[PDB]
Every structure is written in structure tokens, then in C-alpha cells.
Design a protein around this ligand. Structure first.
Ligand code: NA
Lengths: 321, 318, 322
């Protein structure tokens, strides 16, 4: 059996990139080894994922690789070099690997994104030498400092980090994945909804300033699409696309594949909500759709079995064999 | 191996109905298609489920079928006609399908249930014409406006919705599934100003007096009271149903309200106690919220498949 | 896509078998806050097999009852209005422990009165009856009954705790002719939020010096829950907890939590590297034994949390367990 769809198939932007949630801020670890990661890359390849982004090379004292710099700063040796593993898997499945910058926790504790520059000066340089120059699949940088609004030190940090990434790698692509300060941006507020969600006009004003400051060293912007309502997608995607076009940046969508509307934070999204978000991205003329996060929220291998079913609904809608 | 039970088996009211959690307020979606739903109806049939209730035909801008009315009001076209699917599956497995009324969100935002009547006037009409007259398994109506206490506009909303349902369908059954304003009707996981049995009886006596001519059954959610309060509340709820000639059902919750994850499948012994209390009180029928997530072998919550096995062992179901 | 056959193990970049192995687990009955898996004897037998494979030799039923819920048909608790359970779990666990040659520890009853008042001395009275009937019904009849778990949990100086632990430990030891007893308190650290005012190492030592002085004659081991402190605070607290155990002649255990306290879901299986770091710290401090809350949910291949089965595989790889 197969459900009879009552909407047109293949009418949205296909997901062609995914984050790899290491080091995760808030998603429980699946305790996968290389065998499980190899199988997930196969599941990704089947649906046409061509890009994998390791979200943050470290988070506070946790790291994804044996960094000589972070080890000297008192961070914890991991048991596996994940950077090496992901680069080898990306090469095996002919995917582009993007390296996420280090997150020290200082910006999260203060609101000043300039705290994140200094450690990344060392991380960027050692990673280029240790991995960038040696692995064919190293194809880009993810500037992992997340914001939604005008933020102290953000333009300066993005400019400094983007410039160093581009200079050392002879111009590999860079991108950011901020979020929209919408009605579901309730983090740290102690309430189920914001009655003071940002207006489209104020969002445009603040992001016009940010893109004016960073576009020479940030190639794409991939807004997280989940903090606004499903009837606000056209309004915000039109503005985000207009801003990307004005500054010559690629306009991506970070199509969240987890559900923000539920009392469990977080399980896989309802397929129709993801479909609506990808259809809106296609209507707005977006260049690429990526997702946070295939392995937990869309994989047949996920511990969240709703993810394997999401994968099947996704394949049916996009007519993927 | 099999555990040695130290209580008598088959000593509670068997579950013979389940909600279908569409459109869900707060349970994460399992992303099932018709294949998975067909298999879940088979798992339901094995344990003697004979009734399936689609809990709410829409919730705010989400809908379960291509409603011409709700689409004109700006609601979202779904990718599958779930009403058509469930009606076909109910007919295939010889079950009765109950249609849950539309939930606009206006009652939840104001506390006045009278806001839910208007959209349902259009929904009941178009659903009777589109489905009720065409599908054999369309067997009843679920009045989805949930309350626990005396509520502004509730008696008149239940009266209006029940009357329209009955009139258009030439008297198909109707029911409500309210909750008890008990210690788990919550900060924290519990509280100290739970409704008394006496005050609950007073308010529901007035509600049943007002609605009994067009509401055939009441299925209180059984989970917001403590397990040692079941006999007291079930005795009152059965006495009120008898007073107004209504059927007395239990909505035996199969998820756990006592845990910090909202929600995973219930501990079997808690469900057993609730079904045993319903049988002691002489209840007509037990339904559950919700088989597919909380008792199914197909659920993403694997504690549900184990619950299904403990349930079959207790009820001696092959 | 199909999983590759064979060994395709991650290349470890840390020394292997460099932490204290987990050789005991709680059995989370009656649970305070972990959703029930609805297992029967078949599933529990299989879980005991998964435990035996990794060298678990001790199983601890965490609390023989909690408020009106109980794990066995207690004549005393039934007279007090508590609920008859459908299975005698004490009988089941004792039979499974004997089958797999493990020691079973009996967790004392938790009435809820201490949780509602902050005074642990309220837990003494019901346990006088529970200890008495359980020794007669089970302790004298089952070979695998090997110890007692004093389930009254604290982290700081607590009203009536020293008196409670002394009374309960003494009755357990007297009735059973000296079987071992232990407690599993927690550290009042930065993750004890159920923070910037976490207890200092100095204040923790001061208070636990007083507690251990009062209870060491009838409490053989202390197994602090290791999860409420940060991973860079393990050496400081474990050094102090070992120093206190040595001063009072007690065994120094670690209750190595196998669930993650850093996540917005309370709780799913821990990240292996976090568990590894906690077991590595216990071994550096010279701890005698590692137990865990809780194998069945958080490390078992049978758990509903499939991250647990993967944790079991990472654990076996690090410890070279076949
Ligand atoms: Na006292």
C-alpha cells in the first residue's frame, strides 16, 4: 500500500546537505561508531545528499579531533578522530565536507560573539595543515557562531573568521546558519510562545546591516526555518532571498527536520510541515536546502523510528527510488 | 518464559476503542503512510478493538481532509486525505469510525467553548455529504471540545454540535471525552487543590442535565486523578451517567502522566488498575488515548510493543 | 543500504581499558522517573544475559516500594493500603540472579515522607516491618540474596539522615547476620538543579566527614552518583570521596550514571566518551567498584532507547569484551 497524495509530488526544494551533529549542544548522542556512520552516509547518498557539515569542531571542553591547541587549553581528548572519519566517509561517497568552527561557550555566556575569534585563529590554521591540505573532500567552512538579531561583535567575528578561512584555504566556500527571532524562539524565556516576535521589517533592517558587513567573506546564508509559523514562510523567505540577492550571497534554507511544536525537545518533524517549508523555499527561488539533521531526524538508522518513516514519506513525495 | 502473575487475569474492562491522534495537539508524528496504518489496524483487530475515533478533523490551520470550507479560511492543504483512509481501513477491518469535530484554537485561547460551534456547522455539513453518505464505516461523532469543569459556553456548544450531528446523520451516536480536574491536571508533576468528588459531581450534574439528549456517552480521561481515587470518581461518573441515561465509558490513557518525559507508554500495572476499577464500577466500554503510539507493536516507543504483550498476557488474547 | 559485515570499528586515539569496569547495575524498580519498559520475565532473563556478557556480577533493586507501589506482595504494605503488583519482582530477580550467578541487593522501601519533608528519619518505621518480612520471605530462602541498598538519597547534611542510616543499616545487618549494605547519595554540584552555587569540595568533605563518622559501622560502601558535577571536577571530588572512605574504613564505589544529564530530554543514554571519562577518573582515584544507574534502559541492547545498544557496543570495544 501507499497513501494517495492529494498535493503535487516533487514540488519543493530537495535536501542536498545535512549537518553532522558533532559536538551537539542539545541532541542526545546515538553512540555510533564508524560502521554506523558509513551506513548513514549510504542512506544520505540514496536521497542525493552531496554535502555534509560537521556543526562545531568543539564545544567548550569537548572536541571532535585531537587538537594540539585545544588540548593545551585543557579540553578533553576524544576517543575517536571524527574529522578524519567524516573526511574519509565524504571522500568514499563523493560528498563535500564543511568544517564547523569551534564554539568556546563564551559567546553563549555573554552575548558577545567576539569571544569566539581568538580560539578559531588557532583552530583554523591547525585544521588546514592537519586535514585541509591532506584530504580531497575538505570543501568548505561553516561559521558556527549562531545569531538571530543584531549582536555585539557578530559582524566583526564573521568578518575575521570568514577572512582567515578563505585566506588559508585559497577561497573555499563559507556559510552561516542563523535563526529567525520568531514566535517559537522561546529559548531562555520560560514561556511556550513569544508575543514579541520580530517583525519582517526589523529583521530586514538588522540583517541588511549584517550582510553589508560580511558578504565579502561569507558566501551563503542558511537561515534555520523553524522559529516562525508555517503561514509566515513566504514573508520571511522573500526578505531573506532579497537580502542575499542584494549582497551577492547564495540563499540557502536550513530545513529543520525535527518538530519545534511538541513538548519533547526534539523528535522528528511531521512530514507535511517539512514539505511546506521546502515548497516555500522553492517558491522563493532558493539555491539549496540543507537540514539539521539527517542522522537523528531522517535516517532509517536513527533511534527515533519516526525518522525512518519520515525518510519513506520524503522519498515518496520526491519520487526517489 | 512468562511472568507468574499474582493477581487474577482477565479481571478488568477490555479496551475496545482507540483514538487516532490526528490532528495531534502534542504527540510527535510517527510519519506513517497507508501501509503502516493498515498494519496498525491489524494489530488493533487482534486485541478486539472495534471502534476508531479520529480525535480532531482539524486543529487551527492543520486539517485531516481537503475541506473546501477550511481551505477558504486559509488552512493548509494536507498531503493525504486521512478521513478517506481511515474510513476505508475501518471498513476493511469491520470497525466503526467516529469523526472528531474541528478544533479552531479559539476555545483554547479564550476559555469560551462557544467559539467552536461556527466552523463545525460547515465541517459537519460538508463531511456528512463528502463521507457520511458514502462510507459504510462512518459510525459516529466525537465532540472534541475538551473540558474538566463548568466552562463558559460549553453546555450550549455541546448541545448545538450534538444536535447538528444527530440531525444530519439520522441519529448516529455522539460522545465527549472530558478530563477530571485532579492532582495531575497541571508547575511540578502534581498539586494540592484538586477538585473534590462533591464539586465535580455538582458541575457535571449540570452539564449532563444540559447535554444528555444529544450526547450519548461520556468517556472521562482517567489519568489526572491518583490510582487510589479511581473508585470514588468512577462511582460518581457512573451514577451521573445512569441519572441521565447516558453510556459510561472510560478513556483509559495508555501513556504515563507520572514521568518527566511527556509522554511515553504507561506502566502496564497502572493501566490494569484503571481497567479493573472501570469493571468494578460497571462501565459500558473502555477506549484509549492512544493505541498507535502507546500500545502498538509498530510504535516508535518500543515500550508500547512490550505493553501490548503484557496486555495480551493479562487478557489471555492469542 | 546494508550495514557492512565485519569489524569496521573506529580507530581509538585514547588508551583502551583505562577506566574501572561496571560490575553492578541498579534494577529500576520502583522507578521515580524513568518510563517503564513493560518487560516480563522473558525480557528480564534476556537482559540478565546481556549483563553477564559484560561482567556484571551484582544487581540492585533500587527501592522495594515507592509510596503506594511495591515490587513484591508485602503483607505490611498491603495492610497500609498500597497496591498489589501483578508480578513478584523480588522473587523474579532473586531467581534470575541465582541463574546467572549474581549477588542481589534489596533496596529499602521509600514512603515518600522524606521527599515531602526533608527529614529522612520518617523512612525508618515502615522499613522496620519491610526488613523483617523480607528476610523471612526471601533472605532465608534464596541463595542470591546478598546485600541491602539503603535507598534514602541525600547530597548534603540532612535532618535525621545519620540516625536513619544507622537504624536501617543496623537492622539489615542484624537480621541477615552481616550482609553488606551501601548508600548511593549524590554530589550537590552544578547539575543538581531538580547553577552557580554548587557545593565546594571543602564543604562537601566537611559534611560527609560527619555523615561517614556516624554511619560507617553499619554502612559498608558509599557509591556517589557521579553525574551532578562537571567532567573537569571528577578528580577533585573523587579524591575527597576516596580519602573519606579510607578514613572510615568503607569501600569506595562509583555510581556511574549511563544516562545524559546535559540534554533537554530527561533522560536518554549518555555519550560514551562522557561515561568513559567518569570511569577513567574512578580508576585514577583507586575506586573499588563501579555500578551504574541503569543498565536495562541506558546500556542494554534490549532497551527502547536504541542509543543504549550502541553504547553497549562502544563500551565493549573500549574494554575489549567479546
Ligand atoms: Na526523627
Amino acid at each position: 500500500l501507499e497513501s494517495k497524495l492529494i498535493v503535487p509530488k516533487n514540488n519543493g526544494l530537495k535536501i542536498t546537505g545535512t549537518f553532522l551533529d558533532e559536538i551537539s549542544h542539545d541532541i542526545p548522542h546515538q553512540n555510533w561508531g564508524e560502521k554506523e556512520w558509513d551506513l548513514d552516509f549510504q542512506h544520505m547518498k540514496r536521497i542525493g545528499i552531496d554535502t555534509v557539515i560537521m556543526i562545531r569542531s568543539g564545544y567548550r571542553k569537548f572536541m571532535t579531533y585531537p587538537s594540539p591547541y585545544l588540548l593545551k587549553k585543557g579540553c578533553y581528548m576524544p576517543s575517536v578522530d571524527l574529522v578524519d572519519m567524516y573526511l574519509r566517509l565524504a571522500e568514499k561517497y563523493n560528498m563535500k565536507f564543511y568544517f564547523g568552527l569551534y564554539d568556546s561557550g563564551r559567546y553563549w555566556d555573554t552575548g558577545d560573539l567576539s569571544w569566539e575569534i581568538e580560539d578559531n585563529k588557532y583552530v583554523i590554521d591547525e585544521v588546514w595543515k592537519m586535514y585541509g591540505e591532506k584530504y580531497k573532500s575538505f570543501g568548505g567552512w561553516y561559521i558556527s557562531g549562531e545569531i538571530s538579531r543584531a549582536t555585539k561583535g557578530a559582524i566583526d567575528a564573521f568578518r575575521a573568521m570568514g577572512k582567515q578561512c578563505k585566506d588559508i584555504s585559497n577561497g573555499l566556500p563559507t556559510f552561516i546558519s542563523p535563526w529567525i527571532d520568531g514566535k517559537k524562539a522561546i529559548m531562555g524565556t520560560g514561556k511556550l510562545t513569544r508575543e514579541d516576535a520580530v517583525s519582517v521589517q526589523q529583521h530586514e533592517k538588522e540583517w541588511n546591516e549584517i550582510f553589508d558587513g560580511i558578504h565579502e567573506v561569507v558566501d551563503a546564508c542558511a537561515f534555520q526555518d523553524g522559529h516562525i509559523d508555517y503561514d509566515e514562510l513566504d514573508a520571511f523567505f522573500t526578505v531573506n532571498k532579497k537580502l542575499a540577492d542584494k549582497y551577492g550571497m547564495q540563499c540557502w534554507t536550513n530545513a529543520e527536520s525535527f518538530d519545534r511544536d511538541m513538548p519533547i525537545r526534539f523528535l522528528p518533524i511531521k512530514f507535511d510541515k517539512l514539505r511546506m517549508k521546502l515548497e516555500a523555499a522553492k517558491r522563493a527561488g532558493y539555491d539549496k536546502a540543507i537540514t539539521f539533521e539527517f542522522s537523528h531526524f531522517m535516517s532509517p538508522q536513527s533511534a527515533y523510528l519516526q525518522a525512518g518513516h519520515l525518510y519513506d514519506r520524503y522519498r515518496e513525495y520526491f519520487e526517489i527510488k
